[model samples]
Target chain A: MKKRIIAAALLATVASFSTLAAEQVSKQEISHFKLVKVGTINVSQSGGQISSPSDLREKLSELADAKGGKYYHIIAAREHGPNFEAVAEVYNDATKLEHHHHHH
Target chain B: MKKRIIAAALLATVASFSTLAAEQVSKQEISHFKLVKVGTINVSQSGGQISSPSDLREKLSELADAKGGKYYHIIAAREHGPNFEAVAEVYNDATKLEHHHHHH
Candidate 1:
């Protein structure tokens, strides 16, 4: 019985950690492709539930579907998971993407 | 006074929209490299301040300094602003990278 109690305690501790991890998600610029913020989307909610990170990708795909967003870049996101909001941006000059390397 | 009231109402409506925008953020694995989560960090506190977003990044940089993480990748993150939580993942077999275009 003592062993079981220890196991339960450890499991609870792990659970709390994951829950803390779940609160993570925010707007961060991970790329250098000049873009513009086109507002935010969806939700950023985590009720202390541990979840798969890939779900964040799926949410981004959803943003890509909104408005004329399908044509724009999903860019970077600020995840709150479900409450997971993201930033959408468009190329400063979509017609000239190759201009980046010209920083040559 | 009536015009000012209308302006205030419009501002309030805009504020509400931004609050909604503030909620967006989640775990989104953006890059192609395989990564393993290091765990969550810091506070994800957003009191609807409509933060500048770079604060999320500073938090991630702090994580990179923890336990050999400096050599690791910050990768993508999920933002809840101050309540923001994030995932830190290391490269899958870091020593020998550039194995990507092998599909070529």
Candidate 2:
């Protein structure tokens, strides 16, 4: 019975950690090409409380194609008391289009 | 001769003061309505120095009508060493269109 209780506790811990991981946001590079800014996106949590969808990955992905923007870079992430704010930059394929041509 | 030197010094001070004033940045609320987030805009300065068009007013005005958003709210502003960043929220009309409009 004790072993079963310990197993259950361990399972609960792993479950909780996954939820906690959802809240951690970062600016890890998601692409590997020269990028140029096409747009910018800002998100926030107000009234001294963090809100759902504040996760960095989810927020960055939100700008996947805004105004022809295809890439992104996080500009800022800050927490003020109970408020949270994140800023991200969006980019398009400037090098591929402006500097390249298909030859026949 | 000494008076002329002092006069030049005062002029120098006045000229420098204007240059100093140009670097200051701030946030002020623009609209008085129930705002909703339609999109977010972020601006960043890299290599540890502010840029030519980094002025808050100029930046905000750039997004005056992107994505059907009319009003704006600055969400975050920060500087790291010489790097500068600013974030803002965009919103469109909500109160008049919604049924919360009163007609007594």
Candidate 3:
């Protein structure tokens, strides 16, 4: 029982940390020829308090990572009363368009 | 000639100050029924240094005001080496639509 509980905790930690791999990139970066659009994500007060701009950006990166994006560009941000919301578009990078693409 | 010079200087000051009246608003604020779309503006290190984000925002406001906008929404901002660029959409408040229907 002890060994099983330890394995579960380690796996949970690894799963959570994996979300932090993605990063935020400027809109111009996403416009590059090597980058391809993945999808978009919206983070709002629906979950909880966003705290600060950095926190909102982190949430965006995590969501983008879950969508298999290497970078995300924030399209919009707003604060309605106490609630804050932001939207970002995700993208994947490739060496060249003519080159073969593969999922990591 | 002296009087003409002074008058020209005063007019220039007033004309420049007029641009500072417009302000920046969040994306959500622009979605309101009272705010109507005016146009869009792009600010870049075209001729001189942008200095900082505040400077970029000020340039956007000035451009928006020149286009008869009361508020502006920044859609994208990016920095490339020593230069930076930003894009914004302008809006006008219904209360000052020059002349329009009553708010009843």
Best by lDDT: 3
Residue lDDT tens for model 2, A21-72: 1010112212322345566766566743422222233444444433344444
Q: Which parts of model 1 have CA positions greater than 4 angstroms off?
A: A1-104, B1-37, B40-43, B46-50, B70-93, B96-104
Give one digit per residue, the lDDT tens place, for model 3 in B42-103: 76775447543335544665676577665556667665566666767766654332322222
Candidate 2 residue-wise lDDT at B54: 21
Model 2, runs deviating above 4 Å: A1-33, A47-54, A94-104, B1-104
Q: Which candidate is the best by DockQ?
A: 1
**In model 2 chain A, which range of ten residues has the least summed lDDT?**
A16-25
Question: Judged by DockQ relative to the true structure, which candidate is superior, 2 or 3?
Answer: 3
Q: What interface Cα RMSD is found for model 3?
A: 19.3
Candidate 3 residue pairs in backbone clash: none
Spell out the clash pairs found in candidate 2.
B48-B82
The global C-alpha lDDT for each of the candidates, from Candidate 1 onward, is 0.33, 0.38, 0.49
Chain B only, TM-score of each candidate: 0.32, 0.46, 0.59
Q: List per-candidate RMSD values in Å.
A: 21.5, 23.7, 24.7
Task: Highest TM-score: give the candidate number.
Answer: 3
TM-score of each: 0.25, 0.28, 0.35
